Amino acid sequence: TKEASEILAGLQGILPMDISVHQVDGGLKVYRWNSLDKNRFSKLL
Amino acid sequence: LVRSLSPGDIVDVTGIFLPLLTETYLEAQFVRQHTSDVEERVMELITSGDVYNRLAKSIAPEIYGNLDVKKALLLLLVGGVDKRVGDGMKIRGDINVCLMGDPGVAKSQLLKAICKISPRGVYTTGKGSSGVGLTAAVMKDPVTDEMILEGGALVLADNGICCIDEFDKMDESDRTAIHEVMEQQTISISKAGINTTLNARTSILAAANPLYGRYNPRLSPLDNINLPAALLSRFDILFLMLDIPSRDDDEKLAEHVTYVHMHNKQPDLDFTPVEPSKMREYIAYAKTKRPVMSEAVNDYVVQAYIRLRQDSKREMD
Amino acid sequence: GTNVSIQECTTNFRNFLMSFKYKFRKILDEREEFINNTTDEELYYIKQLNEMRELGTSNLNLDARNLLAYKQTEDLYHQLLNYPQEVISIMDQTIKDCMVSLIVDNNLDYDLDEIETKFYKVRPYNVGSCKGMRELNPNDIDKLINLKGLVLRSTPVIPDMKVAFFKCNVCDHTMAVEIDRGVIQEPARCERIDCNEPNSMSLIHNRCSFADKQVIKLQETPHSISLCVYDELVDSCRAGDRIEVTGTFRSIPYKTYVDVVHVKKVQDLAKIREVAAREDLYSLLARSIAPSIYELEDVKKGILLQLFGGTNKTGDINILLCGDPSTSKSQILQYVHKITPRGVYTSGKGSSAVGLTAYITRDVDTKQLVLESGALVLSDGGVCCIDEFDKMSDSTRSVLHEVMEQQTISIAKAGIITTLNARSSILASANPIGSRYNPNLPVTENIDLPPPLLSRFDLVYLVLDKVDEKNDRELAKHLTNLYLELPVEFLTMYISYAKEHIHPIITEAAKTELVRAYVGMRKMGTATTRQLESMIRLAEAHAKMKLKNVVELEDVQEAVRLIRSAIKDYATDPKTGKIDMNLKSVIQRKLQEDLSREIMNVLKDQASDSMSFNELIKQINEHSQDRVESSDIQEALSRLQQEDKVIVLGEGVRRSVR
């Protein structure tokens, strides 16, 4: 579970265009991914 | 008129009786809970002024030589004061009496007489009429799947007196429930997911034979009971009616009993006991009072207590 | 009665939403000192609208108390308790207006295009405290109320129809028929001009659109009534949970039920401080709990510490009363369950193995797992009172181990494999073996509990009945002064505050004391490690009474002493377990002799004619070895003064012989 958090949070850093993160009650909400050309970004690391 | 009646209440309900066989019901109109017509009868006895002995001799007018026991029964019929301490506390104002005695001492006729006299008396023998007859249980209704209470010996005797003959034969499941009834006047049941408490405001009057069947003078008294100290502590006026043969005491009891079966009267001619109808009214009227003692006797009690408290240390050893 | 003037209410709500300040909340509850101008001055519900429009959630939380906290809405508060639907449409329009007015009309941004189409709903939750399920009446129908209770049975997600999909069976034309007020209108003829065959339409089941419906059952008292849940309020309640409900009371033929509108699953401050800093705090609280019971200070403290509890972290304390069957045992337990929320009163033969354990079974039509409650499940978070704990059946006694240590009840039967949670505190009273306590037998032989069970209890109180009139007469006066002719509200207010706000943390210094106390207790060789956590829980419970942010030495030492006093350790022989009924020896006489002689030696050896008692303590008592109580030094010097060997001119000075 704790590994999945760094996975889900890792997506937004490499995808700052389709997912945004904002906090309520101290918890996190995930904005609706507009997935487009998902594969291209992982090669730029 | 909703939320007026409650389970277990004794009420007089006025209504209309309403209906190829028709089914009937009643439409409730007026409800009440439970007098010069009886004040005249009450006046006569207090006019005579003979209160303790006359009523103590009135209960069981066909039983010989038990005046001390009858006096305890007379007080148990009247009862004490149920002092609501407050701050969430509670102290029972009822009297519990145990009648140990040898076979043939008429300690079960008193059980019948107490049930007859009391308006809420319940007569019970054996192991509390088994574990199902004792305490209570929740029973499902096959028609509506609802579960309702079926009152046992103790629950029926609520606000009354429960007589338990042959108390020494009671099982642990029977006697353990007796502890809570004697101490708390309530029954707690946690079965099949139901967690409820039942009102068990009862006066427990138990009569049983010795543990070893009879008493011989060489026998120590505590060996003639199957009951632990906790039960004996919760009892009050714990009697022990030993039978000792005697040509001057068996003669009196035999003469007392033989006159009972010979004529429809008690053997005494100089004393006429109060009839039960008048006894019931006077006891009920007396029960309405709430006496409060004085501080002078309040200091008296703490001296007499210490007097009796210190003696038992020597007596037990 | 359609009392809702729609233009007036939408104007009042416009005023309510666009003008309410968080500051006004502190007025109705009179928390004037709690006014914080740095945050409470800003508008309240505007922040929610800024979030839910950005989060995309179509909901808003309506705290109904703020209607009373604003004057104009007071006329609106009463009518809300009768007409909630109109508010929802107003709020939807208000949100639409908020997007139009506050964003695009203000030219801030344009992130509102889809919002014109989506439907919102605002759910009032914090209606004033209601009268409970058993008090409801027929006149309350259709009026919003509030309830609390326990969840028992939950049905799966039932799909409710909202849109019907019809296809013509001869020309394959597809329609879209919506539901109007719960009715489906089946077309009698195909809508196309060319195809006009009567009764030619057919319903396709799996192309329809459905809405989530969940039926939940709630139990407030042992009564319980059915509840209906819709939409995004699913996946919020499971069997065995405790819920606060704000909903609408309905009836359809008789079938009274709640259209649940909201679901919740989770000045006297100075008066508390005035008691917090007092000196007789512990004695007063201990005495206040049982005004009808004399003395028993240690019994008072632990049972009070039971109500305070430990501190659960990402805690319950259990107590057993062992004593002769005439001493105050039953009365305290009666008080505890009548002073704690939702306590359960239990006895030995009055319960069964499925009495404390909830009867889990499987539904006969929905085949889900359901629970029918139990004594240890009802009192989750509370206190369960068990009388005659010794006379508990062995099977019933067996299931306590998992409950007392893991707070779970696992059941493995035919077709059912699951575990419950029964986190609670246990207060138990046990009569001695036989009739009365016998000091000839060891302590463990007067208790009918096996060591594995006996180790779990945090405190076991040996309540012994003496025959000493020096305490009997005082008890007699306390009893006799009560049958002629802090309060509980302060006490419960105090207790409810501490459990809510106080979360003590053990300090570094207090750590060492717990280690040494257990080591010394273990070194006398029944000192299982379950008693060491008992020390820590009592340590936290003491500071919770103290209302202090930490636990310190005094809390630990008092907790150690309470365990020592409860078990009656020093009065128990360490090699036979027997009780010393006697609790000045020659060894004490020698100790005082040598102490007096050493006081004389120190007084005559120092180069000062006089010295203070603090100076003497610093020179001798605290100089070497652990500090001893100064009373013995005072006793020795008083004896010497009575023998005219030392001069005590005053409390502050001690002077040599004349």
Ligand SMILES: Nc1ncnc2c1ncn2[C@@H]1O[C@H](COP(=O)(O)OP(=O)(O)O)[C@@H](O)[C@H]1O
């Ligand atoms: N003193 C007495 N007066 C009247 N009847 C008596 C007396 N002693 C014994 N009896 C008779 O003997 C019987 C006593 O039996 P019971 O009351 O059942 O005593 P136990 O409880 O010892 O069996 C009664 O039927 C009663 O008629």
Ligand SMILES: Nc1ncnc2c1ncn2[C@@H]1O[C@H](COP(=O)(O)OP(=O)(O)O)[C@@H](O)[C@H]1O
């Ligand atoms: N220290 C005490 N303070 C006040 N009351 C006491 C004390 N010791 C005994 N009592 C009285 O003795 C009675 C004992 O009853 P209770 O403790 O309820 O059950 P049990 O008799 O099994 O101990 C109580 O009614 C109580 O008033």
Ligand SMILES: [Zn+2]
């Ligand atoms: Zn067609």
